[PDB]
């Protein structure tokens, strides 16, 4: 862990793109 | 050692080759000119005393 | 270029050294004048004569001229070569070459043009002809009504007027610093504001009146890989030109000019076109069934040179069908004009003028006379329909005019042409026997030079059986032949074939920036069904059952021209501050990112390069702020928000929060409480992919149209309330129904091809030039990411331990605000000094400053110049003298109540306030008759047993601390001093029975450890407790922090 | 743009090299300048000629 960001290259397997991701309501 | 890309053709087809013994790369060391493309800087090898 | 001194060196010596001495003393000041002077007409080239010159000397200027100029040439090609393949060079360099092929690419522009003006026009009549009698059948076949000319009050133009002179000030609104140049347009920007019929008379007589027009300036746009040019016009003819532009595209919306096939549309993102593409292909009769013998054919191509290969006058006869002919003439009136770079000047006669206002419309109605050519009349007519009930785009009339010709999928965008062919089994072979009749293969060489895609494994792209090759090439060929090579040209380097047929079980096709190969369930296995990003699942309309898949990559151009991105903005130099270095990454990876959703989930490439470029953009900060190079660097450093003082960089990779980096600590009345709280949370989750944003697109305007056809018939006005469920959705967001400006971005068409065509015309890179915002609303959130993100750093108080937060004694953060978008260098790491000035950063060397107790890990000089302006003048001595004199004055008072009949105040060392091998005692009290002593204790224990050991003497030490984000426990630190300093053969103690207290002061803690006689542990509490809230060289010390930080409340 | 000696605030003695075997930073910023330079916003300039490059003399 020092530093060194990391690959995404195989390290997703239960996360999806549209999970997560919300709207926002009307403002008034 | 470090090293000192090929499209489909009529040539490679996988449809027409027999495949029944997967061949190894001793096979292709021994008679470097039977199952090599470009042998560019290979030697003959001694065959049998 | 010490050789080329050398050279002319060698060059003057042997012009000097052949004269004798009665001309060597005349013409060492005679020639070196005009010998700058020759190569100085030569770079601007300006054809070198003088009169009075003999002829040997001359041929050895013209001789010297050429040789430097070989020199230079290929000096400035070997220079681009360097940059162009991504080697690191100074920004002089380029600035420099960028001159250099400009005035390259002007000598070569001026050379084309005077070769036109010799040559004569490279078109025949005979052509010219056939293209204008097409152009009439095909107005004559639609019944097109020309564009008038606007008399005298048309009642649009002032919304029209309003429109141009946005899209105007458009440009000018990122900077308020601006030139003497751009302050008149502006001033002649407002004076149109506040006169409009004044300049709408103006715009009209220079329409009817003006053929003469100021010079154009010319500039280069410095990409790594091609150059691109950027027009500047004279602003009192832009106002009119953008307001002909916003007229032509209105008029030509209206009447219908532009059939559907013509792509950018204002309705469509481009990936929006890909999956409308995809479905169109799709969606047709039988389109996969390949058992008796049928062929797919996708062709993908470019025109090239369609920019400069258009002729002026027949550009003119090709527009006085569609417009008033003044109108004609003054847009070939402006095409006419002469270039200038700084030298150079230059008359435009061939080709036109891209960077003007109205040339989005020129483009894209020539460009429909090359799809008369291609396409053909009688598809054209079964493709658009009739004028009265005109198509959709990829539909058709009924079935039988779709599959009664082989060409029928068609698209455009804005050069690149994609068709696709279905071909049978005779009309293949008679295209084949049409194709090898004029060109026979008799050793099967339409092998190689065969474009293929390699992004792709073997047995998925493009398998080059003999047949389907043959097919190709006979489908280019077919193509090539309709076009005349004086119009336009199509070239096979340059373009792409792809055959689907029963050899061949997947079609390929490469369109605005995606590779998409579609593969059919019939020719693969089972119904497995894993789920993947980046795989569009295809369905027919009629039975809905699942037909093909579609995968998405992105292409090599795409990231090479962010790699190249990246390389720009690793030029920044030593005096630029972090945080623009941070937005331009940001910035760069949104525009990559809600570009192309779905597709960087797919391609590895791309996920190794964004992960590669971010590691090289934290390596120029970890450089920028000490030299060596740290074992560990933390990522809080980086990720944290701007509100809290960070970076806020953008993630895409796997980072993972160490743990003992999520605690933090607090100290109160009862004493000091410890608190605990992973991964970074990336980008590419919290944005929606394309085919859902497309599903619940025609959703939510499902809904609107029937919600809005039952309100008409109920008289009643759709409002927030019903429209509060179908917010943020929709291509053009639901949102933008509830602009202020409906009646004025109403009257806005042909938008998207003209924020395409503003890269000729703005000078800086445009991100987003695929759509706009007030035309499509918003189309990501990143609210919920900095949320996530300061939830993920272990909350608000966990992220402020790094930041020398509690030095400045601040009760909360809410009520706090920084002093003003960007942060200095010297702020940002005297705010972070707690978290970079550590032992686990910077291994091994540590020092120690002269005048204070604080630890320097490694060497910083930006730290350092802080360090000395806050603890200047002996402060860390005055803090432990007031500290020491305040506790004197505390044990001076209440004498009887804990039996003390002497207190003495010790002879402090000047140097004891920071030596921190030994110590001494500072305040000692001597005990009336006898004093029992407890164990030795923290401040904060109340759990003590008392011995009989009676001793006299006491003795209280004082001792400072300077800590960082992993050493700052202050009760372990003062328990580890009193048990080494009582333990020890150099520290000099009068009494075995005393306490040491111990005070942080980059966290403001304090503690004590040590025996206690009793009534003196309440008391030296609230002592400490008054001191920490009432010292006046510890608010010194406060307030020279917060000048230093530049944080206010 | 550079910092001059003057713009310092507050700069003091050199009085001693170490104790207990820590090395003593000499609170001013002299061998700085003498390796170095400043520009006007604070950030720092090494110079990089080391030609021999010594590699017992970088780390002693």
Known sequence: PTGEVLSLVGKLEGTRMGDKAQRTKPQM | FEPLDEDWNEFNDINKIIIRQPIRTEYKIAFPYLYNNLPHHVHLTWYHT | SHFDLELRAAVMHDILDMMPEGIKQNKARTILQHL???????????????????????????????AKADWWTNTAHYNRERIRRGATVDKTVCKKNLGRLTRLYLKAEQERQHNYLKDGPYITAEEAVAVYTTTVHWLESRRFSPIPFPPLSYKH?????????????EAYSVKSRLNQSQREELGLIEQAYDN?????????????????????????????????PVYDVEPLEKITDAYLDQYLWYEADKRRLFPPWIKPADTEPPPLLVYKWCQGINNLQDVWETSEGECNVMLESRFEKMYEKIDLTLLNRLLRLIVDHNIADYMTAKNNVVINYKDMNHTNSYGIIRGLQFASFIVQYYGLVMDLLVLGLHRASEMAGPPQMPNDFLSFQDIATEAAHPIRLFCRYIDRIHIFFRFTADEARDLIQRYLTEHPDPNNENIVGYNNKKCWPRDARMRLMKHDVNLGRAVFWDIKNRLPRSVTTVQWENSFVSV??????????????????????????????????????????????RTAQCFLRVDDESMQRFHNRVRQILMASGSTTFTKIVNKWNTALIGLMTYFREAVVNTQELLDLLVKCENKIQTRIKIGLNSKMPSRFPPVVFYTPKELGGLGMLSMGHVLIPQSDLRWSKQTDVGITHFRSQLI?????????????????????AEYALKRQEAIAQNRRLTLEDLEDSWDRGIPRINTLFQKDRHTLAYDKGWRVRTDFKQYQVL????????????????????????????????????????????????????????????PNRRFTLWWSPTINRANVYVGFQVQLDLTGIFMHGKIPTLKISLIQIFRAHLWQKIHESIVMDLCQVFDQELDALEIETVQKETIHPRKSYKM??????????????????????????????????????????????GDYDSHDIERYARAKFLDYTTDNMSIYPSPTGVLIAIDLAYNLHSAYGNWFPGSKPLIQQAMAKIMKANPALYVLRERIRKGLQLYS | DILASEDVEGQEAATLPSEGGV?????????????????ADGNYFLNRDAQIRDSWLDNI
């Open chain 3, 196 to 228: 409009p019929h004044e300049a709408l008379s103006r715009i009209k007589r220079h329409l009817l009146t003006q053929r003469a027009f100021k010079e154009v300036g010319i500039e280069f746009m410095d990409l790594y890989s091609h150059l691109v």
């Open chain 3, 36 to 66: 700058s002077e020759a190569w100085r007409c030569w770079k601007a080239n300006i054809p070198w004569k003088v009169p009075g010159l003999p002829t040997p000397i001359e041929n050895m200027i013209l001789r010297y001229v050429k």
């Open chain 3, 764 to 823: 800086k890179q445009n991100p987003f030039w695929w759509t706009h915002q007030r035309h499509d609303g918003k189309l990501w959130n990143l609210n919920n990411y900095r949320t996530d993100m300061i939830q993920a750093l272990g909350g608000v108080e966990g992220i402020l331990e790094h930041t020398l937060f509690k030095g400045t004694y601040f009760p909360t953060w809410e009520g706090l605000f920084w002093e003003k978008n960007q942060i």
């Open chain 3, 917 to 962: 091998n030994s110590s001494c005692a500072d305040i000692l009290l001597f005990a009336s008759y006898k004093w029992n002593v407890s164990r030795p204790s923290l401040l904060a224990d109340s759990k003590d047993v008392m011995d009989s050991t009676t001793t006299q003497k006491y003795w209280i030490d004082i001792q400072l601390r300077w």
């Open chain 3, 681 to 701: 949370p990336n980008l590419y989750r919290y944005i929606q992919p394309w085919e859902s944003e497309f599903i619940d697109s025609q959703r939510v305007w």
């Open chain 4, 23 to 39: 090395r003593i930073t000499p609170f001013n910023l002299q061998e700085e300048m003498e390796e170095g330079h400043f520009d």
């Open chain 3, 157 to 169: 133009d002032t919304k029209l007027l309003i429109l141009a002179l946005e899209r105007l000030k």
């Open chain 3, 500 to 545: 689907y047929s029963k050899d061949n079980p997947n079609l390929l096709f490469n369109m605005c920036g995606f590779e998409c190969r579609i593969l059919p369930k019939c020719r693969t296995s089972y119904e497995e069904f894993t789920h993947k990003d980046g795989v569009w699942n295809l369905q027919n309309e009629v039975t809905k059952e």
